[PDB]
Amino acid sequence: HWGYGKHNGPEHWHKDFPIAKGERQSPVDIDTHTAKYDPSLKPLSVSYDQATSLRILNNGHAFNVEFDDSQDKAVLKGGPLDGTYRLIQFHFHWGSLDGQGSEHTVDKKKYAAELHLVHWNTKYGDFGKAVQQPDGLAVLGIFLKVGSAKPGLQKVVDVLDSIKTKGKSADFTNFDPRGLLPESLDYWTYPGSLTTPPLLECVTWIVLKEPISVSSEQVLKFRKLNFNGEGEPEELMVDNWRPAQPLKNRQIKASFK
Ligand SMILES: CC(=O)/N=c1\sc(S(N)(=O)=O)nn1C
Ligand SMILES: [Zn+2]
Hints:
The chain is mainly beta. It has helices spanning about 125-130, 155-160, 215-220, and strands at about 30, 35, 45, 55-60, 65, 75-80, 85-95, 105, 115-120, 135-145, 170, 185-190, 205-210, 210-215, 255. Keywords: Acetylation, Cell membrane, Cytoplasm, Disease variant, Lyase, Membrane, Metal-binding, Osteopetrosis, Phosphoprotein, Zinc. It comes from Homo sapiens.
């Protein structure tokens, strides 16, 4: 099965998922000098005050925090989007070292980790239908850099012990994802794909320009997770990121000048 090790990592995915070599794959490098300011772009509208987190799960590739998405509780609108997108889960990608870990890069700069808030277009009725549509998902990407601790992340960091191996989950209620947002919502946007298999090209990416900072100690706790399941050989969950893919026929737009 696919993963991030040397025999089954990203450069192998195309043998099982040939869309890996598609025209609108993610992530990409954001060249800040060739991105186009588009004043047609609206501000983002993040409405997370009624969010209901349910659970945190180690799925063998990352950990996900899952939300109740059976109603318009936590939604994303505005920006380049049409319609209403519901939050279903968030997860991170991170590195073995502080100089790598993010999926997107900015003028080839890598960050220590990248947060993905995944949302699906309610007009398609459920997540599984949405991933079949070119406008079905909107993923908010936020970079993490190492510096001062992020207090709103510590609830997540503290439970990681209880989901160390693949397939473990824990109740994770009353977590407020607003505590993970930077001060500014300026962004870049481009049409792209999921960054793990099945690599479907159904995502409007919205990548925030301002990183959040987390402490060394917080990211170190990410690095103690396991890709393996309980009882199996320990393989630390690190470097679960996909490298930048060719931009091909796409334009990155910026909401700011
Ligand atoms: C969110 C979900 O159910 N799946 C995902 S989200 C995703 S990501 N990385 O955000 O692009 N990749 N995949 C396969
Ligand atoms: Zn992701």
